[PDB]
Ligand binder design. Structure first.
Ligand SMILES: NC(=O)c1ccc[n+]([C@@H]2O[C@H](COP(=O)([O-])OP(=O)(O)OC[C@H]3O[C@@H](n4cnc5c(N)ncnc54)[C@H](O)[C@@H]3O)[C@@H](O)[C@H]2O)c1
Ligand SMILES: NC(=O)c1ccc[n+]([C@@H]2O[C@H](COP(=O)([O-])OP(=O)(O)OC[C@H]3O[C@@H](n4cnc5c(N)ncnc54)[C@H](O)[C@@H]3O)[C@@H](O)[C@H]2O)c1
Ligand SMILES: Nc1ncnc2c1ncn2[C@@H]1O[C@H](COP(=O)(O)OP(=O)(O)OP(=O)(O)O)[C@@H](O)[C@H]1O
Ligand SMILES: Nc1ncnc2c1ncn2[C@@H]1O[C@H](COP(=O)(O)OP(=O)(O)OP(=O)(O)O)[C@@H](O)[C@H]1O
Ligand SMILES: Nc1ncnc2c1ncn2[C@@H]1O[C@H](COP(=O)(O)OP(=O)(O)OP(=O)(O)O)[C@@H](O)[C@H]1O
Ligand SMILES: Nc1ncnc2c1ncn2[C@@H]1O[C@H](COP(=O)(O)OP(=O)(O)OP(=O)(O)O)[C@@H](O)[C@H]1O
Ligand SMILES: O=c1[nH]cnc2c1ncn2[C@@H]1O[C@H](COP(=O)(O)O)[C@@H](O)[C@H]1O
Ligand SMILES: O=c1[nH]cnc2c1ncn2[C@@H]1O[C@H](COP(=O)(O)O)[C@@H](O)[C@H]1O
Lengths: 484, 168, 56, 88
């Protein structure tokens, strides 16, 4: 049918060879035939791994450890555990993700009958809680012999430091082997207790449910789980011989996908490392990068990678372009690399520069299958480090990995350390992103991110450049003083 | 009244109006491209409202990456609509008199002003003082203050300085 | 200060792919070295942005 | 002070004169004819859940049982039963 031609196709928009970024263009609206909630955000991460949402936490030491990775997986995406930490630390962070389950306690504190009540108080003072089970040896692999809680402690003066007070195994309510959270709810409703230990058929302690965690149980329909129903976890790795040791520990910890982490991924070092991974761990999925041009992409795709990370110098913290004059504007880079990678079925990750929801929708419309964020997902409850006040506002530290404060643990600084404002929790803010992405797709006329990319490649999705003036007018203007 | 007038919902509503109240004149919108205009003109509208994200209060482009620069939009939509005798309204972005003359020269038959007519004696609500000057409240219809009567903020709430009377 | 410059020049040539400044110019003259213009927006994004208060 | 009604001031004095250490002063209490929703009402207006139950609903009849946050905390908003009580 006749549709009047108005706007540029993505190929015509990028044919003038200006350095366009996300702020230089707009997507033209289409035809709406569906509600915003009907928009499907399902997304390929690699040749084999599919997420229910396009969003990824960056492998940065101020962004992604196990709590961020768990929250990102549960909300629909994935996180990649950073590597500015020991090989054993990183494998322990991966293990925490891969052995998480909702409502169940992860890595429980446990004691022996030979401990003192002073050790129960010490566990309360360092960990913040007191309901600790007691076992015949000392932890998570022996007969449950009883429980001690703060109500077993209360009326002991500090004069008393007796050995474990304990409510004995005969008194306890316990789950038998492995339970759906409904049988746990029915036990903790009818028992009025604060803990439900889970034992074995030979009565080893195997897990615990806290009443507090069970009362906070919710539906996670986009849970982002592997075949054995555990959460997906990624990890970052370098390209030096020391990284062959991490790659083994992260494999033993059960990592699903590796991201090879460099600023310029088209090296002999990275190609060697990709061939090593694909020849030693053929079950493992490898994302190479970062690349900004199609020639870099071609080398890495021949090396056999399963996805590409796209970006160089667009990061909020990056100063790579100012010190080495090398990079590419991020809209152009995403378009070109994704167009090349699509000829081989390889998905790309649009990494860097994201600040708004429009940037996410723009990057997805230009061919990116997923979006990686450091700065947007930073300063949240799940982000590493702890907050600190300055001028009356909660700020969290956010350092780029090539900054002198990151490489402390002649060197040219490629990054900058800084701070972000407090944001909230990933489980409250990722829904805002998902809702804005869905409304943007609805205004564009795409019922899924796959259909969005299919409309862009066939010339149905139209675009429009913006002068400086049009970017000014597309903001907020003319008001005396507005507020958000 | 919508931000994206090229929906099944608006076309249904236009057909309903033209079949129940055939004496009534309907302006559809908002549209920024000629394809949207074509759908609405087939649906039988009597005029078009043109604009998306140029408003003084709007932040639609920053949150959904969708819109068009207003001079281009006015020209293109008005050029298409003129082939059918349909007038368009250049809506949004007006701040000066030159903007009105520019929009009229690009093919708009009328100009819709929100912020430029706000903070007048005739505008709704009541004045307040800040920093020794009279202000009136001015807000987007999809700002969180307006739409309170998870939701995404399409617009902003703010202030405009006192202006006088429409008749002056 | 000059060693800092020499180290940055060497790392920039290494990211570009040139093992010497003579080879760099030879790649530029033969069309192997590729370039890319920048809008105002791309120069803004190529800086430091979005942070509350950074430091060098 | 006396910048208050005579009955308010006598109630402030009566609170002091009937205080005792560790014991609760002016306890919140409910009847078996109240709903679980009245325990939630008493909570977000006072800040506590451990409310005893008696035949007249206050300080002056057989103690018939207690209702508390662990008697409430697995009920959905779908349930607004009359008083879940731990019995005498
Ligand atoms: N994407 C960006 O825009 C960008 C820019 C700068 C830094 N970074 C980040 O900074 C961190 C550090 O990575 P990087 O960028 O410094 O690159 P890198 O750590 O991979 O390499 C740094 C230097 O060591 C060399 N090198 C790497 N592996 C080697 C090997 N096996 N043998 C010999 N030399 C080897 C490289 O060629 C380079 O000169 C990463 O997190 C990276 O993503 C990212
Ligand atoms: N500058 C602009 O053009 C612009 C931008 C944003 C908002 N606005 C204004 O904000 C106000 C709110 O309008 P809006 O933009 O949110 O659009 P809207 O209220 O018409 O529609 C909002 C959402 O509801 C849906 N909807 C509408 N009718 C429906 C129906 N019958 N069944 C199902 N879904 C239906 C739409 O598809 C859309 O997802 C208006 O005053 C509008 O002009 C204007
Ligand atoms: N033994 C434990 N090992 C690890 N985590 C625990 C343990 N006991 C409690 N937690 C966790 O600590 C948090 C608070 O738990 P809970 O409300 O049950 O505190 P508690 O054990 O009763 O301590 P307290 O007496 O101080 O209130 C929950 O997230 C819970 O999962
Ligand atoms: N599963 C259980 N089976 C039997 N007794 C238990 C069980 N869990 C806890 N207890 C015992 O019940 C008593 C209360 O502990 P519980 O965890 O229920 O509350 P608590 O967290 O100590 O109470 P509070 O929140 O007031 O501090 C203690 O004597 C404790 O040892
Ligand atoms: N029924 C009541 N009437 C009046 N005051 C009460 C009552 N129950 C508790 N309080 C007071 O409230 C404060 C907190 O008491 P407590 O720790 O026992 O809370 P609770 O009744 O268990 O409520 P919650 O479930 O929220 O913890 C204490 O100072 C206590 O004296
Ligand atoms: N004096 C009592 N005699 C018998 N049962 C009681 C008594 N006081 C409370 N209970 C019951 O014991 C259970 C736990 O109540 P308790 O006051 O000890 O904890 P809670 O306030 O409900 O929970 P928590 O302290 O963890 O916040 C409830 O089922 C309650 O009805
Ligand atoms: O210190 C640094 N220097 C350069 N690039 C970095 C640094 N740390 C992280 N990056 C890149 O910046 C991306 C995050 O971009 P941001 O979300 O805009 O801040 C990461 O995924 C990396 O590709
Ligand atoms: O909340 C809002 N979000 C988006 N656009 C709005 C909102 N409220 C009003 N508008 C648009 O803004 C136009 C007025 O533009 P203004 O005169 O520049 O302020 C109106 O006619 C509407 O099309």
């Amino acid at each position: 049918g006749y549709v009047p031609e108005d706007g540029l196709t993505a190929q015509q928009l990028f044919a003038s060879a200006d350095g366009l970024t996300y702020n230089d263009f707009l997507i033209l609206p289409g035809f709406i035939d569906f509600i915003a909630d009907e928009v499907d955000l399902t997304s390929a991460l690699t040749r084999k791994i599919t997420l229910k949402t396009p969003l990824i936490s960056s492998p940065m030491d101020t962004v992604t450890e196990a709590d961020m990775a768990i929250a990102m997986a549960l909300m629909g995406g994935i996180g990649f555990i950073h590597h500015n930490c020991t090989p054993e630390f990183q494998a322990n962070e991966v293990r925490k993700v891969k052995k998480f389950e909702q409502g169940f306690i992860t890595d429980p504190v446990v004691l022996s009958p030979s401990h003192t009540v002073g050790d129960v108080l010490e566990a309360k003072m360092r960990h913040g809680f007191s309901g600790i089970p007691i076992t015949e040896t000392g932890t998570m692999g022996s007969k449950l012999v009883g429980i001690v809680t703060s109500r077993d402690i209360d009326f002991l003066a500090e004069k008393d430091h007796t050995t474990l007070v304990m409510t004995p195994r005969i008194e306890l309510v316990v789950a038998p082997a492995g339970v759906t959270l409904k049988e746990a709810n029915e036990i903790l409703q009818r028992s009025k207790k604060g803990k439900l230990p889970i034992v074995n058929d030979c009565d080893e302690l195997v897990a615990i449910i806290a009443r507090t965690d069970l009362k906070k149980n919710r539906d996670y329909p986009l849970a982002s789980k592997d075949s054995q129903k555990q959460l997906l976890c990624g990890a970052a790795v370098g390209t030096r011989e020391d990284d062959k040791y991490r790659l083994d520990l992260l494999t033993q910890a059960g990592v699903d996908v590796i991201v090879l982490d460099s600023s310029q991924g088209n090296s002999v070092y990275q190609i060697a490392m990709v061939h090593y991974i694909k020849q030693k761990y053929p079950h493992l999925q490898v994302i190479g990068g970062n690349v900004v041009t199609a020639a870099q992409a071609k080398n890495l795709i021949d090396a056999g990678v399963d996805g590409l990370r796209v970006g160089m110098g667009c990061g909020s913290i990056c100063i790579t372009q100012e010190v080495m004059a090398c990079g590419r504007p991020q809209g152009t880079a995403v378009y070109k690399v994704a167009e090349y990678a699509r000829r081989f079925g390889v998905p790309i990750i649009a990494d860097g520069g994201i600040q708004t929801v429009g940037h996410v929708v723009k990057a997805l419309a230009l061919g990116a299958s997923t979006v990686m964020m450091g700065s947007l997902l930073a300063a949240t409850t799940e982000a590493p480090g702890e907050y600190f006040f300055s001028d009356g506002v909660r700020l969290k530290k956010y350092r780029g990995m090539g900054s002198l404060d990151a490489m402390e643990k002649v060197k040219i600084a490629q990054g900058v350390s800084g701070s972000i404002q407090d944001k909230g929790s990933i489980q409250k803010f990722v829904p805002y992103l998902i809702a804005g992405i869905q409304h943007g797709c609805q205004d564009i006329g795409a019922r899924s991110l796959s259909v969005l990319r299919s409309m862009m490649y066939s010339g149905e999705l139209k675009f429009e450049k913006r002068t400086m003036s049009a970017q000014i007018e597309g903001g907020v203007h003319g008001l005396h003083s507005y507020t958000f």
